[PDB]
Amino acid sequence: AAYYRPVEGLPPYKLKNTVGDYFRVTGEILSVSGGVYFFFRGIQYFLQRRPSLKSLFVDSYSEILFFVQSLFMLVSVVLYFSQRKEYVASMVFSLAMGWTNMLYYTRGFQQMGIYAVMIEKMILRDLCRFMFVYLVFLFGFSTAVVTLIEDGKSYNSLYSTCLELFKFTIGMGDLEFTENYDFKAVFIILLLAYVILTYILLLNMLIALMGETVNKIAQESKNIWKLQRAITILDTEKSFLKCMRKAFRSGKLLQVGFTPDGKDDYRWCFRVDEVNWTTW
Amino acid sequence: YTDSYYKGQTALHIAIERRNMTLVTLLVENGADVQAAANGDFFKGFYFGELPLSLAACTNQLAIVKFLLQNSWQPADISARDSVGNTVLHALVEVADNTVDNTKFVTSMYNEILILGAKLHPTLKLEEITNRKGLTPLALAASSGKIGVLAYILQREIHEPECRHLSRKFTEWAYGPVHSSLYDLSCIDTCEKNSVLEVIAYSSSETPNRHDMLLVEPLNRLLQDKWDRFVKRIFYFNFFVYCLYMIIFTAAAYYRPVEGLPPYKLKNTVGDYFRVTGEILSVSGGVYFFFRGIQYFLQRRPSLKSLFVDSYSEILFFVQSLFMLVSVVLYFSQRKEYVASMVFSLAMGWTNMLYYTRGFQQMGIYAVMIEKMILRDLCRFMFVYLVFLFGFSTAVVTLIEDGKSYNSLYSTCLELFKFTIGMGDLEFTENYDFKAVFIILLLAYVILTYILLLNMLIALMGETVNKIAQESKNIWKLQRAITILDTEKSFLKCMRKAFRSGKLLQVGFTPDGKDDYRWCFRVDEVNWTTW
Amino acid sequence: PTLKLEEITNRKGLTPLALAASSGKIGVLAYILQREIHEPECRHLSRKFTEWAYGPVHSSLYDLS
Ligand SMILES: CCCCCCCCCCCCC(=O)O[C@@H](COC(=O)CCC)COP(=O)(O)O[C@H]1[C@H](O)[C@@H](O)[C@@H](O)[C@@H](O)[C@@H]1O
Ligand SMILES: CCCCCCCCCCCCC(=O)O[C@@H](COC(=O)CCC)COP(=O)(O)O[C@H]1[C@H](O)[C@@H](O)[C@@H](O)[C@@H](O)[C@@H]1O
Numbered sequence: 072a073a074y075y076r077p078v079e080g081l082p083p084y085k086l087k088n089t090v091g092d093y094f095r096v097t098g099e100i101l102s103v104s105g106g107v108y109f110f111f112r113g114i115q116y117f118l119q120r121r122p123s124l125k126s127l128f129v130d131s132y133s134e135i136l137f138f139v140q141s142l143f144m145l146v147s148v149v150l151y152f153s154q155r156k157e158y159v160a161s162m163v164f165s166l167a168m169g170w171t172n173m174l175y176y177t178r179g180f181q182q183m184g185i186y187a188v189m190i191e192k193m194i195l196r197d198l199c200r201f202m203f204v205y206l207v208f209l210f211g212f213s214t215a216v217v218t219l220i221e222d223g224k225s226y227n228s229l230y231s232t233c234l235e236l237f238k239f240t241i242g243m244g245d246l247e248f249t250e251n252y253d254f255k256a257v258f259i260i261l262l263l264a265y266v267i268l269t270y271i272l273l274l275n276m277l278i279a280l281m282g283e284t285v286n287k288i289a290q291e292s293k294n295i296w297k298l299q300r301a302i303t304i305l306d307t308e309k310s311f312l313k314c315m316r317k318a319f320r321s322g323k324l325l326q327v328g329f330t331p332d333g334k335d336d337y338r339w340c341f342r343v344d345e346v347n348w349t350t351w
Numbered sequence: 352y353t354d355s356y357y358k359g360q361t362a363l364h365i366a367i368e369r370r371n372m373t374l375v376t377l378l379v380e381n382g383a384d385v386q387a388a389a390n391g392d393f394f395k396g397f398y399f400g401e402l403p404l405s406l407a408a409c410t411n412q413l414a415i416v417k418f419l420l421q422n423s424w425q426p427a428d429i430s431a432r433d434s435v436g437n438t439v440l441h442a443l444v445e446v447a448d449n450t451v452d453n454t455k456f457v458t459s460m461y462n463e464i465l466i467l468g469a470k471l472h473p474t475l476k477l478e479e480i481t482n483r484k485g486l487t488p489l490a491l492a493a494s495s496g497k498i499g500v501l502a503y504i505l506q507r508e509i510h511e512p513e514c515r516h517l518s519r520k521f522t523e524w525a526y527g528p529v530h531s532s533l534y535d536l537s538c539i540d541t542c543e544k545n546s547v548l549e550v551i552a553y554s555s556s557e558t559p560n561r562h563d564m565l566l567v568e569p570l571n572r573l574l575q576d577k578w579d580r581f582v583k584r585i586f587y588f589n590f591f592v593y594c595l596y597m598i599i600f601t602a603a604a605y606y607r608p609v610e611g612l613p614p615y616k617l618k619n620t621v622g623d624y625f626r627v628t629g630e631i632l633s634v635s636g637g638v639y640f641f642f643r644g645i646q647y648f649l650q651r652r653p654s655l656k657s658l659f660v661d662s663y664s665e666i667l668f669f670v671q672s673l674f675m676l677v678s679v680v681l682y683f684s685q686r687k688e689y690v691a692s693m694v695f696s697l698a699m700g701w702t703n704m705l706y707y708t709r710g711f712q713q714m715g716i717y718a719v720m721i722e723k724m725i726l727r728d729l730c731r732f733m734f735v736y737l738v739f740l741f742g743f744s745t746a747v748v749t750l751i752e753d754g755k756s757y758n759s760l761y762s763t764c765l766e767l768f769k770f771t772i773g774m775g776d777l778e779f780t781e782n783y784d785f786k787a788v789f790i791i792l793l794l795a796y797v798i799l800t801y802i803l804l805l806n807m808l809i810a811l812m813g814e815t816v817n818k819i820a821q822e823s824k825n826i827w828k829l830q831r832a833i834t835i836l837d838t839e840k841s842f843l844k845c846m847r848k849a850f851r852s853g854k855l856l857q858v859g860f861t862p863d864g865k866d867d868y869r870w871c872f873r874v875d876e877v878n879w880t881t882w
Numbered sequence: 883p884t885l886k887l888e889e890i891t892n893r894k895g896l897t898p899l900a901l902a903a904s905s906g907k908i909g910v911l912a913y914i915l916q917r918e919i920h921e922p923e924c925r926h927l928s929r930k931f932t933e934w935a936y937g938p939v940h941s942s943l944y945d946l947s
């Protein structure tokens with residue numbers, strides 16, 4: 072629905088009497104419906120759990136991400152009926168977030184779920200520290216370079232210089248992106264120092280620190296995945312969707328026979344079988 | 352008991368299971384049938400071989416085993432076979448689980464029962480008896496991955512007369528530091544039904560210890576001996592022939608004619624004669640690998656899951672040949688799309704050179720590590736990466752709006768993929784409104800994929816390679832073992848080089864006066880203690 | 883014998899098992915959930931119970947109220 076959005080101006084767009092547009096508007100309605108669903112699901116989570124406003128930012132990442140996706144969808148609806156093309160700006164963000172939120176469902180598969188947990192850990196530790204230091208270096212050297220740059224007889228904008236210096240990180244730095252300066256030695260020394268500090272040192276250091284992190288979160292990631300699947304199980308059981316009663320266990324088994332009283336005692340037990348070849 | 356869950360259970364079975372020696376002796380003395388098999392669904396639960404003697408053996412009740420085997424009233428038939436043909440030794444193999452304590456118990460009980468069987472029936476070849484599947488206890492231990500009892504059996508040594516003939520490991524001589532051991536290789540290299548090497552190598556990939564069973568001393572030394580003897584040269588010759596095949600295929604494909612509508616009329620010129628000869632040889636090799644893949648499928652009968660969790664090289668060579676044959680069909684169908692098939696075969700053919708990295712330990716272990724990386728780390732990475740790539744490509748191409756050639760999902764996916772290879776433009780289009788949205792999307796994509804996910808792939812590869820050294824070595828050894836067995840089965844000249852150091856006289860004589868030749872393998876060792 | 887001591891809740895509505903789970907007392911939690919007693923007139927207090935023992939095979943019942 073988003074791919075085939077009409078490109079005329081000023082929404083809302085009058086529905087045309089053609090098959091493709093009927094499919095398009097049906098897809099848009101379903102998209103907004105799902106956005107509303109996730110919006111109210113996020114509200115239900117917030118109300119039923121009452122997060123402490125710190126548990127939101129150390130926990131419950133998936134609920135926040137789905138809720139923010141739905142918020143972008145609803146802002147897109149508001150802008151769409153407000154006659155603003157900026158609805159597209161919201162919609163694509165929701166779309167992007169939606170696909171990344173697909174990784175939520177990597178739980179339920181042990182290897183992919185543990186992998187997604189490791190991605191979470193990498194983002195919160197290694198990418199956080201790296202991005203702080205990297206943005207400090209990037210902004211500092213970008214300010215130095217754009218100060219050195221002197222336009223006239225484009226660059227000399229902090230945004231353009233920051234973008235050019237960022238291109239070094241992705242292996243696309245020109246290293247001669249401008250000549251509009253005096254003191255070419257100063258320009259190249261600044262760029263080389265930036266490259267050595269960020270590209271050669273800091274990015275390879277990020278790789279090394281991610282190796283150190285993954286070496287020591289195997290069991291932690293497995294336990295967190297098990298906890299995530301446990302939350303999935305409890306939420307599915309709580310919802311249960313058709314008045315089903317499959318939550319029960321092996322039955323009212325007569326475990327100990329009787330209490331000290333004459334009453335016979337039924338416990339609702341779960342049976343676990345085991346084998347032991349010593350201590351007969 | 353007549354109920355299907357406990358069908359066939361008797362008082363003797365209960366007395367043995369309860370470990371009541373006195374009740375067992377009284378029941379046997381009172382006429383309890385020692386051959387009364389228990390066939391309940393529970394006794395399949397816990398399996399012990401559907402016999403009270405096998406029940407006593409499986410519960411570590413040695414006294415009851417001895418009594419039931421050689422009581423004065425009614426001895427139990429040691430060769431008795433259950434509903435599946437299993438004997439007491441098959442039952443002992445089946446209850447093994449390769450743990451330390453269970454392995455010790457199974458080893459002790461197996462040794463004692465075999466010695467007692469020899470003493471009571473010196474003429475009985477107890478271990479030669481197969482079950483209904485056709486497996487001896489050794490073949491069952493190999494088939495089921497019972498590495499503990501397997502290692503015990505293959506290295507079994509006994510030091511008393513009239514029972515040392517049961518052993519398979521025998522000390523030929525002891526000088527001072529130097530000792531010489533002879534391992535019995537009967538039904539290890541050839542058995543005429545199924546050998547231990549055939550069982551281990553051609554296992555169904557669900558066997559627990561298929562990679563580890565070849566580390567048992569005689570099997571490892573045997574496979575190395577076979578490699579050094581005659582298989583190394585044959586394998587290197589096959590590698591050379593495959594190199595010639597792929598060089599000829601590369602030359603023939605490189606110099607393909609560029610006119611339209613194949614087939615191409617042969618010109619009476621030297622270069623075209625060489626070209627068409629190369630094409631004929633390429634198609635011949637394709638047919639060869641096609642029929643070899645069919646032969647593998649028929650001779651193994653893969654379970655339609657073992658094709659895709661194991662035996663990747665056979666699949667790859669077969670698919671290469673399939674591309675070659677599709678290329679032939681399109682060539683004679685007057686379609687230029689044959690080139691599309693041919694290059695794929697060509698590409699696959701060269702990657703199939705990695706198959707021949709086995710036979711070189713470092714390169715073979717490296718290729719095994721490549722396999723593991725592809726199946727674990729590249730698989731997980733590619734799933735997450737493709738999710739991110741498709742999501743951000745859809746967002747970007749939705750944002751892109753042509754006006755006055757991007758705005759195609761393929762082009763945007765390609766541009767976003769270029770970031771992975773260090774060639775991302777980051778300003779590949781201006782055909783949008785909301786430049787902040789475009790650049791924010793691209794920066795988020797770059798941070799998630801290039802900076803985070805790809806470096807994370809490097810880190811996960813580091814963890815994986817750290818934790819698969821021994822597994823990779825064992826898998827390479829298994830691959831070379833499969834190579835050895837296939838070369839032995841083919842053998843190419845009616846040769847008989849698979850045999851061991853001769854019909855050596857290991858223990859001299861059985862309990863009878865007949866001398867016993869065992870086809871032994873000699874292993875020399877040096878020890879500075881236990882002189 | 884008539885008192886269900888562990889069913890008593892505190893002011894927060896938590897039983898000792900719920901309190902052990904809530905406060906992260908994994909040790910006492912693991913003890914309680916796997917608690918087994920092997921005498922009459924006290925095995926009713928247990929939660930882990932051995933339903934049967936054959937030879938190598940044993941079957942346990944975990945009370946999960
Ligand atoms: C414009 C476009 C932007 C795209 C941005 C996209 C970011 C990545 C998207 C990843 C989506 C996966 C997901 O859905 O969220 C994951 C990862 O989250 C993040 O790392 C976001 C970083 C910000 C965790 O979700 P979860 O709710 O399971 O949190 C865990 C609890 O379950 C558990 O009980 C434990 O308490 C545990 O300590 C908790 O963590
Ligand atoms: C268009 C262009 C496409 C190019 C694609 C090219 C891919 C790489 C080509 C690599 C070729 C090497 C090879 O020939 O295959 C290798 C690697 O296979 C792969 O990784 C394919 C991934 C898909 C393994 O071969 P093998 O049959 O020995 O399998 C092992 C058993 O032997 C053993 O008993 C064990 O059970 C073990 O668990 C088994 O694995």
Ligand SMILES: CCCCCCCCCCCCC(=O)O[C@H](COC(=O)CCCCCC)COP(=O)(O)OCCN
Pocket residue numbers: 228229230231233234237786787790791794
């Ligand atoms: C880690 C990556 C680093 C990338 C560097 C970005 C930060 C630099 C500082 C931003 C300054 C905002 C700005 O002033 O830039 C705006 C351009 O708008 C934008 O495109 C903002 C994008 C938002 C960035 C999201 C983070 C007007 O300057 P202009 O020189 O482009 O005007 C040309 C119009 N004829």
Ligand SMILES: CCCCCCCCCCCCC(=O)O[C@H](COC(=O)CCCCCC)COP(=O)(O)OCCN
Pocket residue numbers: 759760761762764765768
């Ligand atoms: C991991 C890397 C990711 C790369 C992204 C590729 C996948 C994007 C989705 C494919 C869409 C198919 C398509 O629609 O693309 C076809 C082009 O055909 C192809 O070239 C398909 C290549 C097959 C890709 C193999 C996977 C017509 O679109 P066009 O814009 O090129 O038409 C131009 C004609 N004037």
Ligand code: NA
Pocket residue numbers: 241242243772773774
């Ligand atoms: Na580059």
